[PDB]
Amino acid sequence: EMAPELQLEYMPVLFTRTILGPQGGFAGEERLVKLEVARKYMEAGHAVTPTEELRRGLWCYNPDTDKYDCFIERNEEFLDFAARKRQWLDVYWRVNTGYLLFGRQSWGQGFLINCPLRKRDVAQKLWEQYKVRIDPRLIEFREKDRRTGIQELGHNWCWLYLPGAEELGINREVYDNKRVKVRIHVRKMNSMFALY
Amino acid sequence: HYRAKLELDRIRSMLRGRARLERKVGLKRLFFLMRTQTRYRVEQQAHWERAIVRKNVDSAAREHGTGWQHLRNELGRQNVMLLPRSQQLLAQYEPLAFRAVVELCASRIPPPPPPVVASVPEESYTLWPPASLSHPAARVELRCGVERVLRRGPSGLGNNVNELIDAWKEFDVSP
Amino acid sequence: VQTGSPTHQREYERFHHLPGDVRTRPQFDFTFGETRADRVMFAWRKRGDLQL
């Protein structure tokens, strides 16, 4: 359905190994990846060209023995499960990779903030700069932040609990399959983006 | 460069000593005085004056058992619209009226309802002409205007509204 | 900032607009008795190797 002039810059790719990122995919996915990214994948061995027998079934990377000896039949339910596990791993990677910037007001050169950050604001910035929709109930502040919040100016962090991990089997690859560490950085911005 | 020398030379009598004797000293003195008094009148006198008035009204209310805070908030609620100067004048010269105001504020008397949005009558939706009479909404408005005329002040026109509405018939010449 | 006499406003309350230990009352007070040679009026609690 993609226009031909755009599709010229892509190529169909079957992912042999799960890769996180905007140009990645789960093991056994037919995906239109860009030319350079697909070249990198095929050079690293994490992807192949989608032949018909490969679309029927494909050998995938087995992390237990560190070899590509794990054959997988591409089924409807398998594609559904793999897409869901990929979504879980992807949101974990997004939340755990980078910082979360909060531009707020602070009177003078003080050490604290005027209005402390709450779980609503944390989820707002998550959706804003990570494109992640969550409910604020999953956010847990530190012990020093349970009372007021992220009122401290500078490098902060909190916990983000991700409940559905045991059903997908994400206990091994992730350092902690129950919660994520959300690095937060609050900056005194008196510019137009203060709003507080 | 203008320094108002000719205007300020007339008021050297109000000064004393060297400022009254010598012209330059008196001109400098009067210039400084006028500038500082202008500054004070512009940005400092009103604060002091309104603080005095507020203190007087607060003492008057404390003599009755309330304070300026509650009295002002309840005057705003009851919609009395009495400036602090008028409140002070009542407190000093009409203590009975000031106490009546305090009693009104302290009582559980319902404050006046908010202003009413102008409503359009049901006669506006009447098909006119229904197929030499006036529009029903226009006649209703004429009656309301006649009533509003007759409500304000006693006049010789009379308290009746129908005979006042039927005045073009009085001016009319019967064919 | 000084706004009152030592009876109403204490000497360490001048720095109340600053964050930190100046918003707490000190542990030691040398105002009463013999005046210090270096004129030290108050001393806060030792924060490690630093004392204010």
């Binding site: - | 607060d58 509650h70 | 900032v1 607009h17 964050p19």
Partner: peptide
């Protein structure tokens, strides 16, 4: 306090107006 660390301080003239009494 509105002082701050970097901001310089000034000596404001004490407000000597007549204040209303507080209420319960």
């Amino acid at each position: 306090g509105f002082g701050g660390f970097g901001m310089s301080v000034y000596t404001p003239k004490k407000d000597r107006r007549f204040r209303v009494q507080p209420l319960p």
